[PDB]
Amino acid sequence: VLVQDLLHPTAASEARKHKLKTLVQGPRSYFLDVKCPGCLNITTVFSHAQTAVTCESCSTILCTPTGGKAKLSEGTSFRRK
Amino acid sequence: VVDPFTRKEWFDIKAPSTFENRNVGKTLVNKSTGLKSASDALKGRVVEVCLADLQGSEDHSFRKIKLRVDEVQGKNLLTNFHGMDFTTDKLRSMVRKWQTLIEANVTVKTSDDYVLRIFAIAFTRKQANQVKRHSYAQSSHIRAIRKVISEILTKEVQGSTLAQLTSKLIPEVINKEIENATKDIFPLQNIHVRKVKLLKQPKFDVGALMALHG
Amino acid sequence: KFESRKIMVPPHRMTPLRNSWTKIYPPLVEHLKLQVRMNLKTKSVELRTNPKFTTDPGALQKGADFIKAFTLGFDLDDSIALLRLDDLYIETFEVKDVKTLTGDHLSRAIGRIAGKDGKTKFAIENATRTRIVLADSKIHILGGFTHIRMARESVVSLILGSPPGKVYGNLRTVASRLKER
Amino acid sequence: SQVFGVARIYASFNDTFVHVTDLSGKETIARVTGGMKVKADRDESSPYAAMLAAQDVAAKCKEVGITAVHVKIRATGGTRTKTPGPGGQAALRALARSGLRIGRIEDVTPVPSDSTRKKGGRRGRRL
Amino acid sequence: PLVFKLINQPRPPRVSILMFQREFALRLLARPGDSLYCRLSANVQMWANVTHIMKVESSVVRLEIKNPRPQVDYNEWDGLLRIVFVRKNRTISAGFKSTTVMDILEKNYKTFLAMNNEMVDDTKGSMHDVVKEKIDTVLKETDLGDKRAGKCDQ
RNA sequence: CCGUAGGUGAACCUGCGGAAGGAUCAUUA
RNA sequence: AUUCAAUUGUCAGAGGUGAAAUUCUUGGAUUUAUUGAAGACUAACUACUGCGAAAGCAUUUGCCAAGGACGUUUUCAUUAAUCAAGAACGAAAGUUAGGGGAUCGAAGAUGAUCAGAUACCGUCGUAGUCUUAACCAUAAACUAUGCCGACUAGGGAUCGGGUGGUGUUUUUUUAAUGACCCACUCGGCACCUUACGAGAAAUCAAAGUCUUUGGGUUCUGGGGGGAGUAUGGUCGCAAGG
Ligand SMILES: [Mg+2]
Ligand SMILES: [Mg+2]
Ligand SMILES: [Mg+2]
Ligand SMILES: [Mg+2]
Ligand SMILES: [Zn+2]
DSSP states (O other), rough: OOOOOOOSOOOOTTTTOOOOTSSSSSOOOOOEEOOOOTTTOOOEEEETTOOOEEESOOOOOEEESSSSSSSOOTEEEEEEE | OHHHHOOOOOOOOETTTTTOOOOOOOOEOSSSSSSHHHHHHHOOOOEEEHHHHHTTSSOOOOOEEEEEEESSSEEEEEEEEEEEEEOOHHHHHHTTTTOEEEEEEEEEEESOOOOOEEEEOOOOOOOOOOOSOOOOOOOOHHHHHHHHHHHHHHHHSOOOOHHHHHHTTTTTTHHHHHHHTTTTTTTOSOOOEEEEEEEOOOOOOSSSHHHHHH | OOOEEEOOOTTTHHHHHHHHHHHHHHHHHIIOOOOOETEEEEETTEEEOTTOOOOOSHHHHHHHHHHHHTTTOOSSSHHHHHHHHHOBBBEEHHHOOOHHOOTTHHHHHHHHHHOOGGGHHHHHHHHHTTTTTOOOOOOEEEHHHHHHHHHHHHHHHTTTTOOOHHHHHHHHHHHHHHHHH | OEEEEEEEEEEEOOOOEOEEEEEEOOOOEEEEEEEETTOOOGGTHHHHHHHHHHHHHHHHHHHHOOOOOEEEOOOOOOSSSOOOHHHHHHHHHHHHHHTTTOOOOOOOOOOOOOOOOOOOOOHOOOO | TTTTGGSSOOOSSSOOOOOEEHHHHHHHOOOTTSSSOOHHHHHHTTTTTEEEEOOOOEEEEEEEEEEOOOOOOOOHHHHHHHHHHHTSSSSSSHHHHHSSSHHHHHHHHHHTTTTTTTTTTTTTTTTSSSTHHHHHHHHHHTTSSSSSTOOOOO
């Protein structure tokens, strides 16, 4: 371990470490585009959404705050970004 | 000078009709001169026997059962339920140095107007896949299991009377209800109610006790 | 005219039970003429007798005493001494019963009864005709009353925190008028 | 078949009690101390006194006719020790040796949940 | 009790020459503001005139019983100085209501009122009366109570 | 030994709470 | 559990002991059994550990506010780090005035004994131990190691949180979780090997990055006694700091 690249690490081992200990600090979060089937509309929800986000028309709790990640509703589709 | 063995009179006790082997125990009274004094002498007598010897099973299944005498039938004695316990060496072997012990207690009034106290003990298992040399539980887990044991014990003793309590003590139905009702919370092992106290005795009946004998 | 006793198997000693059980049972079955049945599931050993055995009622108590001895850490040569003699009995005692100790005080008391390479333990088995097994909080000494009584005086010297040199001096004093008589 | 007795062995450091009655503690049948069987004060709790005392208890139980017996053994309990002394063990050896039938052997020692202060103080009590 | 044997005998002698231990000789010659002060200091200092000669460790001390003996009863004075000298560092009010001191003192008081025939009330001391509070009233009535045992004189 | 309190003492003992600046053998997972 | 009270049975002891001895037992002692009352205490589960600034903290349940850690494609933008003065807490024992006072128990009352292996032993036992209101401010208050910040080794673990698994188990019919396993990840309690380096050495992931001597800051020591003494000041009812 006398010599190794601190400029170009291998990307398998690079996102393997902590959120704040990378070479440039990046989040490990994402955004979820959720479709409840009852009203059929796009709602962009944070992956660690820490509040009870309802839908704007139906009173369906899309996600509940459970610690790290917000668990999505059952029978409900999602997409990245 | 005078020998009490010349004076004393050999008596006999019998179980109620809940249990199988009725023919257990042979008691003794110093004097048969005062029959009221003999009756009050046998009223406070509490006979502790093993449950397995009371049930005739050859394996001594570590449960002592202690029984109170009430009524006289011609040198034969009616005996009533008073309480249950284990042997102390069972508790000495039974406590493990690498698991979490749960004690649950509930204050009980029964359907037949008894006042009772039930102490149940639960534990933490190893699963079949463990690597950990110790299996402790968090305090909210322990509070949840103690809530569940209090609810199961409370509804179980409220839905039944003394004969059904004795009839559910012997085949371990209560801890089976614990095992499948707490399997959603934590894996639990070696569950038994340890010890049974009577606290209040009601107004004294006659026909219910011979119905328990019948 | 059968008789069976029930006894408990510790978890810490069931692996030397299955290691040296082949040396455990045939001396008592041959010389002492008993019957043994296991229950490996329920940690129980069935010591039973039969009218087809010899009439000896006290050796059933002796056999329960051998398995009570083996319950508490004891090897097989002390079982041979318990076979041959009758004055030899068993004892437990607690560290907290002499002095209220906690944690590292308990550890230093266990170190004082143990010693460097078990040498004060060696000095207390050889000079007193006693045999020493240390538990976590239990002390165990076999033997007769004149032997175990001076073992009591030594161990309540030592667990009180007296230095082991005074233990050695008092030990050879009581051993000196032990073998003198 | 037979009649079982309810036996008590109380094992202090300085005597032994072999004390038996029938069921539920009705009226005491045999009653010995360590002091009555050997008049030497150094030998109150000797196993010789224990076996001779339990032999006399066994003779009392034989003349009243009780053959089976159930025994529990104990120490003082409480702030003092938990398991019985060897005088109780020699008493067990004597009652098994006597030819009397034995029913059950357990350890009803009165065990505290949480004790009070013992009679030694901070430093210690034994020598 | 070494000086008690020569403090109350009939026909008291002329002088008293004797050797004792030196620290008791400090107790017979102790000032009232000392930690060496005791009950026996008061006992000699108004029943037996005493001074130190011939230091020997041991000490010689010389005693003389006052032939005009002052009319003080030894039993009550000895008992009160005992129950305020055992609690030397404590005060005097709460020290009397102890556990069994607060039985024997009103036993002494009931024998003290046996020839007085004072009516013992149902008020009797747990709130404001003779087992609890009139003791505090009569120690307020004298030079004691708040001034400790290492400050009160004869 | 330390802290506190007390009887004292030619030294010193005792009550309560701490520390090792004091020596882990054997056994098992 | 202990102590005491009531009821119960029975007969020469119980108690304590290097040893004996005192104590109380025909009004039946110790002990056995049925109850009751009191106050402390929270064993075994208990470590391969947890929390709190420290002292300290182990029954269950409810309420009251607080705290660490983690998650955060939230919010403020230097608001920070260390600390004379000053302030809060501070084990045990002690002090005032109350309640309680079961056990233990410095004082005291009592017995002893018999030898220079030797008084540790016993029995009553007051204070106290427990709590409330207010003081007191000391300990071997110890990791005998100031606090913040960066770097210089890994790995077996574990506690709290999080991420992922066509991983396991729990079935009801597949899930969901709960528990378990694996690969991590922060943040704690600890372990084992080294030596690059330190030290006088024992030993040390800090006691290293210090003669190649400077990241910021607070306190203390200058041979051993005299002596935490004299004296002055200061707080405290005092003991005392
Ligand atoms: Mg030093
Ligand atoms: Mg300052
Ligand atoms: Mg200091
Ligand atoms: Mg100097
Ligand atoms: Zn919707």
